[PDB]
Design a protein around this nucleic acid. Structure first.
Ligand SMILES: [Mg+2]
Lengths: 97, 87, 106, 95, 95, 106, 82, 97
DNA sequence: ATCAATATCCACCTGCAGATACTACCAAAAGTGTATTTGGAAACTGCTCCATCAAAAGGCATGTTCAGCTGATTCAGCTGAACATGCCTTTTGATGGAGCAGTTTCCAAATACACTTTTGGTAGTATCTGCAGGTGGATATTGAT
DNA sequence: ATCAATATCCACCTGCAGATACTACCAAAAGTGTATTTGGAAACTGCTCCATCAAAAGGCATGTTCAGCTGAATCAGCTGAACATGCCTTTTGATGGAGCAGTTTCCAAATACACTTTTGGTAGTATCTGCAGGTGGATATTGAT
């Protein structure tokens, strides 16, 4: 059988996902998370479906940009693997923590 | 309504592969095993902050429905302006 | 019976802009040239984005500009990128960009 | 029956001027509408502040002008100032 | 020759309640004044947006309240809200 | 002849705040309680900072509050620090803080 | 002895700033780098300040011009009016 | 002939400067640099004394904070010496780049 | 461990820079009395939002295997810290000199107001067409050897 | 280099979701001429701002010297990628029911606006005093041996 070397498929996935624009998180699970978090603030809330979609677009755009920053931090440390300490450094320098 | 469903642990609905895809879009080649829980936590904070402001706008308007506009205004306040949903 | 738009040589609606300036309570009084100048700026900006966006459409063999095209236009252009540095275009994706060290071999 | 204005017909005219055989999806138009509203509020906001700072109660084309120089980056600022000046001048002599 | 308005006296009164034998430098007062002005502007600006979002012509204490909740951190918001409602209650029941 | 500030039981000028709200173009109309509420909130926050600032002077063997004390008060308190997270207090300096890896090997 | 104004921001002063920022050890290249950053900082802020001056039809930059410039640059300064 | 180990005086200066609030750039050279830069935007300019001061306060507070982030970046790469790449990384994550 | 060089700590003293305190106006508060303007309260009609269930349609979860990355170790070379000696720039402070902000007072142009008429832009209903998604077969990239 | 498994490519086909095409009110432009109001304009005057130089006051540049940091090299332990397999969960497209937005028309409560009396807050000006900065002497830190 044929096997790609570690990192080859990963680079493939980078090109593919950088080329496209669809949401990468599943519609329903994300919806549940929204409803749960919101419910904890206020019971008996409804959501315009486009309110949920706006949250998803915002959330995914935040996370993709955080990973770019995180990646930069890993590479700064002369690694190619992102770690929680990379996310934390990004968020600290961003003024989020 | 016959009853009402209990929402718990829905953060785990944000799967490892979905998180991997977002990293990929973010140009990430290699991912440590701990990233997934870290990201879940970071996403949870993000959503809490935005939903809290969105819901505050909803309540101020005396509605029970969170509108796209509530979310857009919430996003704007937090310096994360979104285009494509009405503002 | 002439529109102020056509008087100014503009496609963007001066009447509208004057009105929105009033309702936004930006000041007590709005001068007559304010909405004319602002409508021209707005029109200029949208022409600049539409130009580059249409080009991105074309580079992708498309007739219809979609959000990805607007995103390519903005992010590939230094000044539009800064103007919109803190804005998210829904369904825009990102620019293809892989860091050097991540590529194979030496 | 509920009524809602947008800048869409204007965006479409301008589109037709720069790319005669090019269309635009409704979501792309929605982003274009957002963009115009967004820049409208930023310019008007800066103009608002600028007036206040100078104890004026009027927002004139000069306030918009300064707001544009404050808001826009280098080369876009330069060109928007032309088109604004140009339009104002034409509007004065056209009337 | 012109009168230059400042929150300084009120700041000073409040200093006296809180720390009766403590004074304050010129600069420190200037900072406190900036702080009041800033917070004023932020609260008002947010209240302003609320009214506009909701197609109302008035800024009522309800807008100020929501504004405070939007701007202030958790515990600071809570107390500020109670201080505000308190002040409004005392003032209404005043013959 | 009795002030609205005394009516509301406040040190901060309800009259001035009302005026400042009108002449701020924040909305067409300003309700009666708004300046009362707003004034209270401003007074409150001032007392919060002045308290901690006073304490800071105290700890430094001083009776007059200077910018340094306002800095120490603000940046040592999580909430004030966040509220003022994008503000610079002239002549405030910084909190003493050295990263532990920079410490010599005890 | 000419020497451009930027170089007036000396090694030891940059060293001092680093110190207040809790910096222990400093590479020789930092000094030039810092000057570059300071220049970009000053450009952005001064530009907006002067734009305020010009608008007011003045020939003097006021403290308030600067304060307003810093505000809009997301760098609110307290203690100089406003 | 007594001599202090490398870094001992550095640490001492950290404590000293973190303790105080004086501006750390000499006024005059800063004034020239301000005026020089202003000159490209408008010629024959005058400056209120407090305007220069405001600019210095803001600049020095800016640079001090940037050195904090810079320092964190150096420590992230397991160093104790700040380098241009550390400044560059901090500014990139801040959105200044 | 000892011994000493230098940094740091505390107490006490003192004049003056920078506080607080006392005063004589007056712009802007509060008072007083109509003049509009507002945004619940009730009462509609009427969608979107929610809930469910079935089928369809795909992505997720888990185990296995090993490539190659991370982080520990050790090392030497170079670079940045320390510090002496040595010069020159910044700080200070009249001076005083003058420029230009900021003060006041003017009126003519431009803005708000109001009404009456005339659009242009929007919501309703009914044809057109980019392209998403499928498929084909030609060719590129990757990795074994 | 060749050889083969698998990904990628580009181009064409096709029905259909999402465009663009024609249409009929009406909220909102435009027009027109009373009536207000602003903010340039012009002429001031008085603080601050620039310059000078005088003083001293002081900080910074340069050279040498070596501690110890950063980066290269080497390597093992093991994490994280690739991919096979089995099955749940999300997606999609129904339906129907209620729950709540959103449109409209009432007036009572509230805020504007104008005008008249009565301060509280400010600038000027005159006292008071925290504490910066210096001095001395005790002991702590650091670094050498
Ligand atoms: Mg819950």
């Amino acid at each position: 059988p044929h096997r790609y070397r570690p990192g080859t498929v990963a680079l493939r996935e980078i090109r593919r996902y950088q080329k496209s624009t669809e949401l990468l998180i599943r519609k329903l699970p994300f919806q549940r998370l929204v409803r749960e978090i919101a419910q904890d603030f206020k019971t008996d809330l409804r959501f315009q479906s486009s309110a949920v979609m706006a949250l998803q677009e915002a959330s995914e755009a935040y996370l993709v940009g955080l990973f770019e920053d995180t990646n930069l931090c890993a590479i700064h440390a002369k690694r190619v693997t992102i770690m929680p300490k990379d996310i934390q450094l990004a968020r600290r320098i961003r003024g989020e923590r | 309504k016959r009853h009402r469903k209990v929402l718990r642990d829905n953060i785990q609905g944000i799967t490892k592969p979905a998180i991997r895809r977002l990293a990929r879009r973010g140009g990430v080649k290699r991912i440590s095993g701990l990233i997934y829980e870290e990201t879940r936590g970071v996403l949870k904070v993000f959503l809490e902050n935005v939903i809290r402001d969105a819901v505050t706008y909803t309540e101020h308007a005396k509605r029970k429905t969170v509108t796209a506009m509530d979310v857009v205004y919430a996003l704007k306040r937090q310096g994360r302006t979104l285009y494509g949903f009405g503002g | 019976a002439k529109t102020r738009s056509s008087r100014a040589g503009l496609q963007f609606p001066v009447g509208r802009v004057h009105r929105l300036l009033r309702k936004g309570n930006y000041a007590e009084r709005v001068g007559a040239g304010a909405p004319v100048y602002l409508a021209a700026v707005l029109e200029y900006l949208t022409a600049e984005i539409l130009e580059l966006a249409g080009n991105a459409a074309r580079d992708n063999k498309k007739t219809r500009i979609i959000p990805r095209h607007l995103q390519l236009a903005v992010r590939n252009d230094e000044e539009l990128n800064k103007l919109l540095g803190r804005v998210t275009i829904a369904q825009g994706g990102v620019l293809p960009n892989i860091q050097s060290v991540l590529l194979p071999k030496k | 029956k509920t009524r809602k204005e947008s800048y869409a017909i204007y965006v479409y005219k301008v589109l037709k001027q720069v790319h005669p055989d090019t269309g635009i999806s409704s979501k792309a138009m929605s982003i274009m509408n957002s963009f115009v509203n967004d820049v409208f509020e930023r310019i008007a906001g800066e103009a608002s502040r600028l007036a206040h700072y100078n104890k004026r109660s009027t927002i004139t084309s000069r306030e918009i002008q300064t707001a544009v120089r404050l808001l826009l980056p280098g080369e876009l600022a330069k060109h928007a100032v032309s088109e604004g000046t140009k339009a104002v001048t034409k509007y004065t002599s056209a009337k």
